[PDB]
Amino acid sequence: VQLQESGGGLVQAGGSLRLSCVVSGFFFDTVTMAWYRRAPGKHRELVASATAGGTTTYADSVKDRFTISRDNAKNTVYLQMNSLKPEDTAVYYCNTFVRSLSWGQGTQVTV
Amino acid sequence: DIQMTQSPSSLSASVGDRVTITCRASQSVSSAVAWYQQKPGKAPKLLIYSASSLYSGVPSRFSGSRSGTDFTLTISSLQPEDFATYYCQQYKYVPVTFGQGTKVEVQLVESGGGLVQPGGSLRLSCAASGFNVYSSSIHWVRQAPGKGLEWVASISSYYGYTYYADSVKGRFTISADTSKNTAYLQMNSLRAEDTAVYYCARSRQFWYSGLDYWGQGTLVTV
Amino acid sequence: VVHWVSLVLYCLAFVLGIPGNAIVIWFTGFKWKKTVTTLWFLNLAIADFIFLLFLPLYISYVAMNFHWPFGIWLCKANSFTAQLNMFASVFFLTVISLDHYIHLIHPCLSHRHRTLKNSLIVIIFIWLLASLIGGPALYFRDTVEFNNHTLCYNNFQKHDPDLTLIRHHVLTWVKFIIGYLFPLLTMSICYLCLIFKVKKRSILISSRHFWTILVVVVAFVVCWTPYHLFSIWELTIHHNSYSHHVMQAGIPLSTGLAFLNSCLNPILYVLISKKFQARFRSSCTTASSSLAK
Amino acid sequence: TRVFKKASPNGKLTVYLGKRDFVDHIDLVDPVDGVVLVDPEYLKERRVYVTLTAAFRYGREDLDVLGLTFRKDLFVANVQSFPPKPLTRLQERLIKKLGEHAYPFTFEIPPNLPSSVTLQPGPEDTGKAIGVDYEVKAFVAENLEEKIHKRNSVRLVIEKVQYAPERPGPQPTAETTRQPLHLEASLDKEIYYHGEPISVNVHVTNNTNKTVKKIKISVRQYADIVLFNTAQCKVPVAMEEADDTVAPSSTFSKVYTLTPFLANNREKRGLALDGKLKHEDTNLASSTLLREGANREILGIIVSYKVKVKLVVSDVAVELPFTLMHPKPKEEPPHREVPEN
Ligand SMILES: CCCCCC/C=C/CCCCCCCC(=O)O
């Protein structure tokens, strides 16, 4: 129902960020969650995802750089980034891989 | 409700450049956003009726786009006959709200209007020709001197529905005469804040696509 | 003797009609949404529940052969409620059949006049008519002490003796004619008009509620025909002679088959519903997304 | 470009449609193409099934206990999406935007089928609308017969419509002789739009000594409803009770203007209206275009419009059939009161 995302910051290239997003009103135990981003002036594309049980998947230019973890104790999924590229600036959204839940306000990150 | 703030309040340019007016909606509305152009001393005239669809008659140099709630109006070339005030209006809900106004630097006739003392009554007749009452929707929009457009009331004779603004509820009433094809607006208990130019606007009753036709101006001083 | 089997039938009807009618009333009057297809069945269950609630008085009156120790008020009330059920149930079945016929055939009328308020008006009219018809039974019956036994009887021997033996005849004639012929003939006409008028006679067979109504109608007719037939036979051959000895032991069976009818309906609902047998043994909103072009 | 999206309460299924008004051309219905999005999980040993069903709901009960649902189906189509015809442009763009876990489904509607028509519910009702409804249902199953929960399914209401033909039809004319009281009647055109006034000529001549004293003109809606048997519901949507009279051995010509609308025809329960996605109101049901000669009985609701003039003699009446259609929209009808609330 309510999705609040935080963890942004004006971190230069090569830095690391620890983003978090809370999903309240939805019990995602067997539901796969994903992360989406819009580059400035572009459309939204999937950047990372993680299935319920043990499997996490990433896009083309995401492997060995970004990691995604999920914790059901607090109903929050994490997305940590390392070795930020100059093109990594975007607005990151937290939602289901199905995109079932209503979209919230993303966090602005720039390098 | 829904409030819109336009980034350019006063725009200055020359002939032969591309301008961009930005509209932002308070709530995540759909593409139901219309753009109007109002020359000084003239009624607003529709340009884009769906935030992406160009109206019939306007030059092709006008265009619009949507991205979430980031409605914009772009002009490829600022022609000499393009300097006017542009307004951003949504029609997804009854309390339609117009933009603050960006400044660049089938006949409808309204009757009545004049100097009325506060607390008095006044009635305006909106003579409509060229369209049917049941196939169109009649709206009243007032513009205060130096301010933007404000919606007053609307009537849909097909479903028999009448709507009024929250600031004119009870005091204001609207009616339409089918035989004479005329719309009437009766005002009661006129306050000092009612000084505005009243426009009788017509919109397509089925699948509302903005206010296609407007009036001429019946400024009322109280 | 047929008295023991009559007692068994009364007890079975009571025990199988108290909780079944209770749960039917609970489902159709407190849990399900109020629409005009189950209000008739809810009123049917209400009438059956009232009759079975007043039944144990008669059960105690008949278990010990012929003795009514309760007051005259209860002696009138039990028979009044029995006749009230006998008339209201068949009237409700008749209006169910009429509503079914109007809904399936000539749907123009059923799409405008099938309002819930009209259903309430029809229910009220049916209840008042049933009460008016059963009122003579409420007024005539009293108690008499004969052979050191206080027994309930219809006071057809009222002060005027000339009118006696005629009030009973006209009363039971009106009762039988109306309450048997009019609903049964009307329902038979409605059912015979439903058939031979609906083309492609396979849409009715396709596991719809037509069988639900038909089973109840058939059970009611089968259970209530022997009582009326025995009563009319007794009327016909009562003035001739007293050679009919089986009549004394014949009517107790129907008086009790018609009572088991009042409880058969929950069992019919169980039988004609597989899912209900299974339990007995035991939306988002439309959004929108962008598109690149 | 914007497309519609609905998700299941579970949150593992979502059906993407680009349009919700599949226009029925007389011999070619538009295809119902879309994309369903599924997680990599929840489908390891199951299948995705998308079902398009047309129903003729005639009662607001919805009780699946003793057949008290009144939701008889008329056309059921089943396709297999996840287990693998060229994809359209919309499906190709949707797949690219969503990802590799995007299975496209396409439905073909056979011709000569009823359109989305819903009868007017009434003021004091809280149930589902009665009429023909088209439903798109997507679920996850591996047997096509097991019961599916409402939570683990996606249901979307789509509406099929018919618009005004480009070529105008012939001018309707009618004339009858009674004993003579020759009554002629004709409209200005055959195709009419919703809210557009209708003009009828009532040019009539009288020769007998008998004198008429009342002229009655009405526009009636002919909603042919056939589920169990062929039935016809005649409801007047417009009324004009003129008081014109003509003397014997004289003529009388006059033009009358009529306009059907829902403001006055609101208390008429069971009146046929356009398909409703939600509890919002819609205009009067449009006419149903059917193939000439090559069309059998259409099991459903068929809407027809006839305007009649009656000379109350103290009656002689004629029928003038006309066509009431919405014009072809630019982008799409919203299927909602554009100024909601
Ligand atoms: C006229 C029929 C009345 C009979 C009432 C007895 C039926 C009991 C069924 C048990 C629950 C049925 C579930 C219906 C679906 C729902 O709950 O909405």
Coordinates of C-alpha atoms in Angstrom, one line a residue, chain D residues 70-333:
Chain D
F70 CA -27.2 -16.1 -13.0
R71 CA -23.9 -15.7 -14.9
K72 CA -24.5 -18.0 -17.9
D73 CA -21.7 -18.0 -20.4
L74 CA -22.1 -17.3 -24.1
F75 CA -18.6 -17.6 -25.6
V76 CA -15.6 -19.1 -23.9
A77 CA -12.1 -18.9 -25.4
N78 CA -9.0 -20.4 -23.8
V79 CA -5.3 -19.9 -24.9
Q80 CA -1.9 -21.0 -23.6
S81 CA 0.4 -18.1 -22.9
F82 CA 3.4 -19.5 -21.0
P83 CA 3.8 -22.8 -23.0
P84 CA 4.9 -21.9 -26.6
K85 CA 0.9 -16.3 -35.4
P86 CA 2.9 -13.1 -35.6
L87 CA 2.8 -10.7 -32.6
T88 CA 1.3 -7.2 -33.2
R89 CA 3.2 -4.0 -32.6
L90 CA 1.6 -3.5 -29.2
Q91 CA 2.6 -7.0 -28.0
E92 CA 6.2 -6.5 -29.3
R93 CA 6.6 -3.2 -27.5
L94 CA 5.1 -4.5 -24.3
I95 CA 7.4 -7.5 -24.3
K96 CA 10.5 -5.3 -24.8
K97 CA 9.4 -2.9 -22.0
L98 CA 8.6 -5.6 -19.5
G99 CA 11.2 -8.3 -20.1
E100 CA 11.7 -11.9 -21.1
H101 CA 8.9 -13.0 -18.6
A102 CA 6.2 -11.5 -20.8
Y103 CA 3.8 -14.0 -22.5
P104 CA 1.5 -12.6 -25.1
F105 CA -2.1 -13.7 -25.5
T106 CA -4.4 -13.1 -28.5
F107 CA -8.1 -13.7 -28.8
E108 CA -10.2 -13.9 -32.0
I109 CA -13.9 -13.0 -31.7
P110 CA -16.2 -14.8 -34.1
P111 CA -18.7 -12.5 -35.9
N112 CA -22.4 -12.3 -35.2
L113 CA -22.1 -11.9 -31.5
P114 CA -23.9 -9.6 -29.0
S115 CA -22.3 -6.4 -28.0
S116 CA -21.8 -5.0 -24.4
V117 CA -25.3 -3.9 -23.4
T118 CA -26.3 -3.4 -19.8
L119 CA -29.9 -2.8 -18.6
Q120 CA -30.5 0.1 -16.3
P121 CA -30.3 -1.1 -12.7
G122 CA -32.4 1.4 -10.8
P123 CA -32.1 3.7 -7.8
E124 CA -32.4 1.2 -4.9
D125 CA -30.0 -1.5 -6.1
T126 CA -26.6 -2.7 -4.9
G127 CA -25.8 -5.6 -7.2
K128 CA -24.1 -6.2 -10.5
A129 CA -25.5 -4.8 -13.8
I130 CA -27.8 -7.0 -15.9
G131 CA -26.8 -7.5 -19.5
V132 CA -24.2 -8.9 -21.8
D133 CA -20.7 -8.5 -20.4
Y134 CA -17.2 -9.5 -21.8
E135 CA -14.7 -10.7 -19.2
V136 CA -11.0 -11.3 -19.6
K137 CA -9.7 -13.7 -16.9
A138 CA -6.1 -14.8 -16.5
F139 CA -5.0 -17.4 -13.9
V140 CA -2.3 -20.0 -13.2
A141 CA -3.4 -23.6 -13.5
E142 CA -2.2 -26.9 -15.0
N143 CA -5.5 -28.8 -15.5
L144 CA -8.0 -26.2 -16.8
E145 CA -10.6 -27.8 -14.5
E146 CA -9.4 -27.1 -10.9
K147 CA -11.2 -24.4 -8.9
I148 CA -9.3 -21.0 -9.0
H149 CA -9.4 -18.6 -6.1
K150 CA -10.4 -15.0 -6.6
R151 CA -7.1 -13.8 -5.0
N152 CA -5.0 -15.9 -7.4
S153 CA -6.6 -14.6 -10.6
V154 CA -6.9 -11.4 -12.7
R155 CA -10.2 -10.3 -14.0
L156 CA -10.6 -7.4 -16.5
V157 CA -13.8 -6.1 -18.0
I158 CA -13.5 -5.3 -21.7
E159 CA -16.2 -3.7 -23.8
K160 CA -17.1 -4.3 -27.5
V161 CA -18.9 -1.6 -29.3
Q162 CA -20.2 -0.6 -32.8
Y163 CA -19.9 2.9 -34.3
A164 CA -21.7 4.8 -37.0
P165 CA -21.0 3.6 -40.6
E166 CA -19.3 6.1 -42.8
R167 CA -21.8 5.7 -45.6
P168 CA -25.2 7.2 -44.6
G169 CA -28.3 5.0 -45.0
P170 CA -31.4 5.6 -47.1
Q171 CA -33.9 8.1 -45.8
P172 CA -36.7 6.2 -43.8
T173 CA -40.1 6.6 -45.3
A174 CA -43.5 5.1 -44.4
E175 CA -47.1 5.6 -45.5
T176 CA -50.3 3.7 -44.7
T177 CA -53.9 4.1 -45.9
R178 CA -56.9 3.6 -43.6
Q179 CA -60.7 3.9 -44.3
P180 CA -58.8 7.7 -46.7
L181 CA -56.6 8.9 -43.9
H182 CA -53.3 8.8 -45.7
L183 CA -50.5 9.3 -43.1
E184 CA -47.0 10.0 -44.4
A185 CA -43.9 10.2 -42.2
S186 CA -40.2 10.5 -42.9
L187 CA -37.0 11.5 -41.1
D188 CA -34.3 13.7 -42.3
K189 CA -31.7 10.9 -42.2
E190 CA -31.2 7.3 -41.0
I191 CA -28.1 7.5 -38.8
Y192 CA -28.4 9.6 -35.7
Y193 CA -25.9 10.5 -32.9
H194 CA -26.5 10.4 -29.2
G195 CA -27.9 13.8 -28.1
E196 CA -28.5 14.8 -31.7
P197 CA -32.2 15.9 -32.2
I198 CA -34.4 13.8 -34.5
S199 CA -36.7 15.6 -37.0
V200 CA -39.8 13.8 -38.2
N201 CA -42.3 15.0 -40.9
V202 CA -45.9 14.3 -40.1
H203 CA -47.4 15.5 -43.4
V204 CA -50.9 14.0 -43.3
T205 CA -54.0 14.4 -45.5
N206 CA -57.6 13.6 -44.5
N207 CA -60.5 12.8 -46.8
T208 CA -63.1 11.1 -44.6
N209 CA -65.7 13.0 -42.6
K210 CA -64.2 11.6 -39.4
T211 CA -62.0 14.1 -37.5
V212 CA -58.9 13.4 -35.5
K213 CA -58.1 15.4 -32.3
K214 CA -54.8 14.1 -31.0
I215 CA -51.4 13.4 -32.5
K216 CA -49.0 11.2 -30.5
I217 CA -45.3 10.9 -31.4
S218 CA -42.8 8.7 -29.5
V219 CA -39.4 7.2 -29.9
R220 CA -39.3 3.7 -28.6
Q221 CA -36.4 1.4 -27.8
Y222 CA -36.7 -2.2 -29.0
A223 CA -34.4 -4.4 -26.8
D224 CA -34.7 -7.9 -28.2
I225 CA -33.8 -10.2 -25.3
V226 CA -33.4 -13.9 -26.0
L227 CA -31.9 -16.4 -23.5
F228 CA -34.6 -19.0 -23.0
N229 CA -37.1 -17.8 -25.6
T230 CA -37.4 -14.9 -28.1
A231 CA -38.7 -11.8 -26.3
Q232 CA -39.0 -8.2 -27.2
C233 CA -39.0 -5.3 -24.7
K234 CA -40.5 -2.0 -26.0
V235 CA -39.7 1.1 -23.9
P236 CA -40.3 4.6 -25.1
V237 CA -37.3 6.9 -24.6
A238 CA -38.8 10.1 -26.0
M239 CA -42.4 11.5 -25.8
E240 CA -44.2 14.3 -27.5
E241 CA -47.9 14.6 -26.9
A242 CA -49.0 17.2 -29.5
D243 CA -52.6 18.6 -29.6
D244 CA -52.8 19.3 -33.4
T245 CA -56.0 18.4 -35.3
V246 CA -56.9 18.5 -39.0
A247 CA -60.3 19.2 -40.4
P248 CA -61.9 16.8 -42.9
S249 CA -61.0 17.2 -46.5
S250 CA -57.8 19.0 -45.7
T251 CA -54.1 18.4 -45.3
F252 CA -51.7 19.0 -42.4
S253 CA -47.9 19.2 -42.6
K254 CA -45.6 19.8 -39.6
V255 CA -42.1 18.9 -38.4
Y256 CA -41.5 17.7 -34.9
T257 CA -38.2 17.6 -33.0
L258 CA -37.3 14.8 -30.6
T259 CA -34.2 14.1 -28.6
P260 CA -33.7 10.9 -26.5
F261 CA -31.7 11.4 -23.3
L262 CA -31.3 9.7 -19.9
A263 CA -32.2 12.6 -17.6
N264 CA -36.0 11.9 -18.0
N265 CA -35.7 8.1 -18.7
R266 CA -34.1 7.5 -15.3
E267 CA -37.0 5.8 -13.4
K268 CA -37.4 3.2 -16.2
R269 CA -36.0 0.0 -14.7
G270 CA -34.6 -2.4 -17.2
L271 CA -33.9 0.2 -19.9
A272 CA -31.0 -0.9 -22.2
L273 CA -27.8 1.1 -21.8
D274 CA -24.3 0.9 -23.0
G275 CA -21.8 -1.4 -21.4
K276 CA -20.6 -0.4 -18.0
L277 CA -17.1 -1.1 -16.6
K278 CA -18.1 0.2 -13.2
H279 CA -21.1 1.6 -11.4
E280 CA -20.7 4.8 -13.5
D281 CA -23.6 5.9 -15.7
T282 CA -23.7 5.5 -19.5
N283 CA -25.9 6.8 -22.3
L284 CA -28.7 4.9 -24.0
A285 CA -27.7 1.6 -25.7
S286 CA -26.8 2.1 -29.3
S287 CA -28.3 0.0 -32.1
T288 CA -26.9 -3.4 -33.1
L289 CA -25.6 -3.8 -36.7
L290 CA -26.1 -7.3 -38.0
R291 CA -25.3 -9.1 -41.2
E292 CA -28.1 -9.0 -43.8
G293 CA -29.5 -12.5 -44.4
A294 CA -26.4 -14.3 -43.2
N295 CA -27.3 -13.8 -39.5
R296 CA -29.3 -16.3 -37.5
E297 CA -30.9 -15.5 -34.1
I298 CA -28.4 -13.6 -31.8
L299 CA -28.8 -15.0 -28.3
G300 CA -28.4 -11.9 -26.2
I301 CA -29.7 -8.3 -26.2
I302 CA -30.3 -6.6 -29.5
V303 CA -31.1 -2.9 -29.4
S304 CA -33.3 -1.3 -32.1
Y305 CA -34.9 2.2 -32.3
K306 CA -38.2 3.1 -34.0
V307 CA -40.0 6.5 -34.0
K308 CA -43.7 6.3 -34.5
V309 CA -46.5 8.8 -35.2
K310 CA -50.0 8.0 -34.1
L311 CA -53.2 9.8 -35.2
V312 CA -55.7 9.3 -32.3
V313 CA -59.0 9.2 -34.2
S314 CA -62.2 9.4 -32.2
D315 CA -55.7 5.0 -34.4
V316 CA -53.4 5.0 -37.4
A317 CA -49.7 4.6 -36.7
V318 CA -46.5 4.0 -38.8
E319 CA -43.0 2.9 -37.8
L320 CA -39.8 4.7 -38.8
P321 CA -36.7 2.7 -37.9
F322 CA -33.6 4.7 -37.4
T323 CA -30.0 4.1 -36.3
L324 CA -28.5 5.6 -33.2
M325 CA -24.7 5.4 -33.0
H326 CA -21.8 7.2 -31.4
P327 CA -19.4 8.6 -34.0
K328 CA -15.9 7.1 -34.4
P329 CA -13.7 8.5 -31.5
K330 CA -10.3 10.1 -32.0
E331 CA -8.3 8.3 -29.4
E332 CA -10.7 6.2 -27.3
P333 CA -13.8 6.5 -25.1

